[PDB]
Amino acid sequence: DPGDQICVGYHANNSTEQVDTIMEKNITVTHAQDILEKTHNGKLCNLNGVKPLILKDCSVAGWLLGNPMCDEFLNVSEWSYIVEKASPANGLCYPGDFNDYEELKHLLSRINHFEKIKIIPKSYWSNHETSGVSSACSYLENPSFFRNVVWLTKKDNTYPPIKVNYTNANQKDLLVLWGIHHPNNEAEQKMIYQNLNTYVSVGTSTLNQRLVPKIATRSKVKGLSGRMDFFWTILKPNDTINFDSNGNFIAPEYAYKIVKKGDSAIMKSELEYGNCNTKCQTPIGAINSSMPFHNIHPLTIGECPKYVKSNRLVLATGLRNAP
Amino acid sequence: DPGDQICVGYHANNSTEQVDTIMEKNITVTHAQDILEKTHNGKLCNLNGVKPLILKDCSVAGWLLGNPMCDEFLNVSEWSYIVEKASPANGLCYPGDFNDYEELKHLLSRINHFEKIKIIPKSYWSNHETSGVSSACSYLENPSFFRNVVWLTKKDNTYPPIKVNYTNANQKDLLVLWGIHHPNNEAEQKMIYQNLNTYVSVGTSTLNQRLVPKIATRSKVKGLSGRMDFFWTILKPNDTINFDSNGNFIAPEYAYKIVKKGDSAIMKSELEYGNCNTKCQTPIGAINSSMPFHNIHPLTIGECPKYVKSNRLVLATGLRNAP
Amino acid sequence: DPGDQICVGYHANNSTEQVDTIMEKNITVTHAQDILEKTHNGKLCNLNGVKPLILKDCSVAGWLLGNPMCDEFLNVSEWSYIVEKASPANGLCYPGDFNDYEELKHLLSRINHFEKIKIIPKSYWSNHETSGVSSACSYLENPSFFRNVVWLTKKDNTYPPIKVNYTNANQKDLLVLWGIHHPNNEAEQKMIYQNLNTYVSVGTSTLNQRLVPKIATRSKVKGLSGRMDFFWTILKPNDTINFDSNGNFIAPEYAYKIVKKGDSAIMKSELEYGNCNTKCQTPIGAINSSMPFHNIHPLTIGECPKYVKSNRLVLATGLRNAP
Amino acid sequence: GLFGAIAGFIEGGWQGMVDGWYGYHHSNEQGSGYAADKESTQKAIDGITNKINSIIDKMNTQFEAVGREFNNLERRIENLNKKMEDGFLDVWTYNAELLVLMENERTLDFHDSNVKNLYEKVRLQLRDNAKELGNGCFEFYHKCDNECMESVKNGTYDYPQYSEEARLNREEISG
Amino acid sequence: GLFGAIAGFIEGGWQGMVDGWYGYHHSNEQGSGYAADKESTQKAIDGITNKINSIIDKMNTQFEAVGREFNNLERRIENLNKKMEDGFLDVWTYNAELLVLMENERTLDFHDSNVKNLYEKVRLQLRDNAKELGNGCFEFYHKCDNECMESVKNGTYDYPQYSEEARLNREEISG
Amino acid sequence: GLFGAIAGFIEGGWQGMVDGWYGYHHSNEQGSGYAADKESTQKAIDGITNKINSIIDKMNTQFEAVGREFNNLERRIENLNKKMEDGFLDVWTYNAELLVLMENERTLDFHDSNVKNLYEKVRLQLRDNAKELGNGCFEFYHKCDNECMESVKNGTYDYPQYSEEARLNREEISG
């Protein structure tokens, strides 16, 4: 006749949780831990304390040079990161090229605090006109120009040789920008600058540049056939920048003090500001998670989990749960 | 006395197949699956439907500019990929440099359908000679020139200022090429072009180029001491290219319509055409395989297995086969 | 009553050796093998037979051009690798730029045997002065110049057009260097070279360079406001380099024969020579080890173990050692 | 099952047990009861837990992407940059997906080994004083009860104390 | 062997069996016969097969090389490009060679576990009604034959139906 | 323990044994002695040794860094270069740290499997001619001594030669 018993067995529950294995998929399990974060708030938030710089319809160049379609950004100072559109519409209002633009943008992603300062006031230009202007850089359907650089033209009928310098009396690196104008022909050249064969020279302790306008017949862009080329350098503390020109000089008025370097980024996104806060931002949304992995976007900034391309990552913790 | 029996045992066969393990090598096994493909047809085949462009002894530059040693390729249109030799002998027949050549070759590896079109007919040049020619670019031991660009020289004893444009009235990107000639001295300059201090200008909506010949004494190449520099741009639909010159201009005659972009490659190989077909091509031979891996060459094109450097990859499927 | 016995058991000892596992750390074990090398001699030794080139306070440029603060290196010939400081103080004594400097340094890391040879003796310059000199390139508080290139100035009051060539009659690639001087104004230009609008031309079978001085006002560096730009090319066997100039030419005197190419490196280190020998060198010390891994520095040269970032790597060989 | 226990010879598990992963079910003259082993279930918590944290730690440093810009005559470096970043992302995606698969399997078999190690621990104590039915259960020849239970469990099991009684009950069936 | 079965206590395998990987060999009063288990051999086909496909799938996306050109003043980027491409090729060569080695071993031991799990399944049924010779074989105390065979196999084995007969044959040797 | 042997049912190891990793300890009418198995200990040396060399060989080709210089308008490529080199260094640091962890564990369990495979080899020979105490030890029913020892070990163990003597001693306790 049957007597006493002791059994050896194992836990089970009502769990539908599944995990994967190399030899068998979709194995039902008692306990499992998901480790892949798959959700974001679809918003562009502050990063910890700090508001991003959201350029709207402006490009970095449009911002720095002061395209009239960007007066909103005339005075930005501190940002956590930068957002720019895929194809912003307001950049170089006057057509032409920005030299070493990507190198500048890269520099810019290591900076988070600019202090704009007046380097050469218009009042300096007593023997030149400062009112060079154009329909392509218009404000309210009346012709204007970049807010930050100045288009010098002949005063009366003479354009005297320019020779001005600026010494960096700060303890912060200084970003200065300038440019040159390429006219369409000699008549146009004479009408604007009087002088016919011109140059722009720029020297620091490391830069030794000489520019010369290039006449040529070009297709129209924004109705215009002329062109403007822009340049930038970093002027170090206690160094001096020197400009010489006898025509075509687009002079700096403002320059940018680099007051804080930090980690930052220039993100490409069509989104607007979301008025929210996060510790981890991607171009398509912020992340709020303790997961060690996420799969939302590879370009992130802040304290983030690790990006993987997987749509699913879950560890078995418990054991095979029999039906 | 002995009675009934039941045994528990396991399969065995006469297999010499071996597989490897971290703790023991060359373990004999009953069943194994090889997963590494190790053979190719040593031939350069079509890729699916399409014949490759096999440049023989010509380089990409020789082809595009129309080196007389390449008339075979005057009219190529559609290719699956491009094969070029390590060191092709027929390139720039007249010595000099091709500016941004590798960037152009890279562009070219995203294109598989060119339509050559006449952009500026020789008939246009009513007041210049079009018969600039040289022994270095000879055909049958009598001096010739690139089939696709034209060497303008003085007509009678004058070289009038050139000012011609072309508008891209197609819906396809247009590849235009041109060049400039560097003479050896002022006498030579005057003998060819009459005009002594010359320039070539080229403008589009984005390009603003000015070139100037550079006199200098140079070592001989193909007997020649002069040099020719070539340039290219992509002209977009509905844009206009503008050339101005008062001498040394090597003008475009033909240009290339980009009718199809696709994946492609420029492969380096000494092989000839193999008159065969494949779905996966390498520079040393085509591949016909269902293996997930191969080890023949890292540069492939088409639907291919994964390249690894291993000489052997075989999974155990069965069990240890005892002697 | 108890009878005979046979036990089955396993080895144990008095080992404190520990190894790690994914599920449990610091598991005490009987036998273990360390495979991570963690020590170096903190010295810069010879590499097999061969002594390194240790540049002390000189830069590669200072060495190659012959900065007077570097006469020690006037005659180096064979080295295993090169050591240079993070921020060497003696480089271009006269301020300016070295064109394509990093490309040259990279070339240099494939070379281990230079033979300096006189290419154009000062005796050649019968109608120019060779004594251009400066306080910035001073020796013992009296003004000097680069030992390897020569500053030509006007003789009497004329500077005749220069036209000299050199043919590479060796079977070894030849490194030639030259330069141009940028004066501060036209008076200074006339005082040094008589001729006012000058050029430097350099041609080989592949190079076709034209340089022109650039006047501009610049900040002072080492008291100086002028600048010198330097250039280099590789002249192949049986080719000829051609220089033309009517002023501002800094001519080559010596050039460098490339007698041996091998693997080498330019390492950054503040250390001095250690008078010792090794088979594996890092910038912070040599390695003497049979370990398959090390963790001391990622930039090594010689027969070395594999760098990993780990502070610990030890395989269990034996078994769990019970207390 | 790599160890034959779970879904092997102990087919089916116990909805009844809640206190832990591995345990017992007795049946004496008093009554019934599911009882979870603690010492074994805990060393399986400590294990699986150290696993998750080490999976995470070996992943704390891996490749991070950063946006770069290139102009239209820099297509070559741009492409090199695209390849390099896709390359590392694919490498760490392979690495994590494979690590999880490989350890998932080891985790399940770890449980299977823990169940078989518990069963065997009981079996090796009882020996001839009971019968293995082959279902993860033992029929006691002698009489066991609500303190004879807590003896096999904590390993504190005086075998001679019950050794003789069982021997007679065992042979009573034969003779 | 990690499980002691294959080339352990069942030294040597059977050229005779052809129907599958794991099976039996009986011997009754009727006759002989090798018989392959199907249920176990199939779940070992399904396993090993899912293995090959997942090895392949986790390899479907990995690094692909593309030819680039650089001129003679672009030696630095050229080298960076060479390093990057050799780098990924070496990484995926390591990855595949190691995956195969690691799973090859797991595959062999998987078989060894399947053989031991089959043996134990038989042993746990028969119990005292037969003797384990220690060779992967059982000597029946009672009499088994060509339908008593198909009972241990499909698990459908009425133990009490033969329980008593064996007990006498077993003790006949002693007394 | 994944196999229940080491620190399972053979709790504690032997400081006495020195000749090798796995062995025996007998006790007869003559005397005592620890004796290391050779055939098993050697195939565990050959294994662990082939492991170390293959770990090393699969690491003989991996990424090597080289110093490059970039000027101040080459920050983009410089950064790309820094990322690429940190990337591969992190990848091979992950690879080696993980390989060691994964094989370390397999090495320990390999030992545990070797001990259990030795025990079982002895057990399957002796059978009813002795008793398993459950401690990694067998009490001989019949009498075994300093040449009966060298019989179970080398597998050369004539079972019928001692079969009958044990059967009486075994049943003497019952009746």
Ligand SMILES: *[C@@H]1O[C@H](CO)[C@@H](O)[C@H](O)[C@H]1NC(C)=O
């Ligand atoms: C695994 O489960 C998921 C979720 O239900 C399902 O989409 C997938 O098809 C399953 N796997 C297979 C092989 O069917």
Ligand SMILES: *[C@@H]1O[C@H](CO)[C@@H](O)[C@H](O)[C@H]1NC(C)=O
């Ligand atoms: C700046 O220019 C003024 C005159 O225009 C000059 O006196 C002064 O010295 C210059 N500063 C420097 C640092 O050269």
Ligand SMILES: *[C@@H]1O[C@H](CO)[C@@H](O)[C@H](O)[C@H]1NC(C)=O
């Ligand atoms: C992030 O998630 C936590 C929940 O874990 C929540 O309490 C917190 O409010 C979230 N943060 C934000 C900014 O929404």
Ligand SMILES: *[C@@H]1O[C@H](CO)[C@@H](O)[C@H](O)[C@H]1NC(C)=O
């Ligand atoms: C493994 O087998 C191959 C093929 O016969 C042989 O070349 C190799 O030497 C063998 N391995 C060893 C360690 O001998």
Ligand SMILES: *[C@@H]1O[C@H](CO)[C@@H](O)[C@H](O)[C@H]1NC(C)=O
């Ligand atoms: C092209 O040139 C002709 C005259 O040479 C001119 O009339 C025409 O407007 C030009 N086309 C464009 C788009 O400028």
Ligand SMILES: *[C@@H]1O[C@H](CO)[C@@H](O)[C@H](O)[C@H]1NC(C)=O
């Ligand atoms: C590729 O191999 C298959 C065999 O699997 C063969 O039938 C086929 O003809 C081959 N293709 C070519 C183009 O030779």
Ligand SMILES: *[C@@H]1O[C@H](CO)[C@@H](O)[C@H](O)[C@H]1NC(C)=O
């Ligand atoms: C492992 O041992 C090391 C060396 O004593 C020690 O530093 C470390 O803290 C130990 N691990 C843990 C988890 O305490």
Ligand SMILES: *[C@@H]1O[C@H](CO)[C@@H](O)[C@H](O)[C@H]1NC(C)=O
């Ligand atoms: C070098 O110059 C001399 C005259 O200065 C000339 O005669 C000689 O031919 C030149 N060498 C070459 C190779 O041009």
Ligand SMILES: *[C@@H]1O[C@H](CO)[C@@H](O)[C@H](O)[C@H]1NC(C)=O
């Ligand atoms: C390297 O280490 C070995 C010890 O393994 C030693 O004998 C040898 O002298 C060392 N080499 C040097 C150069 O010190």
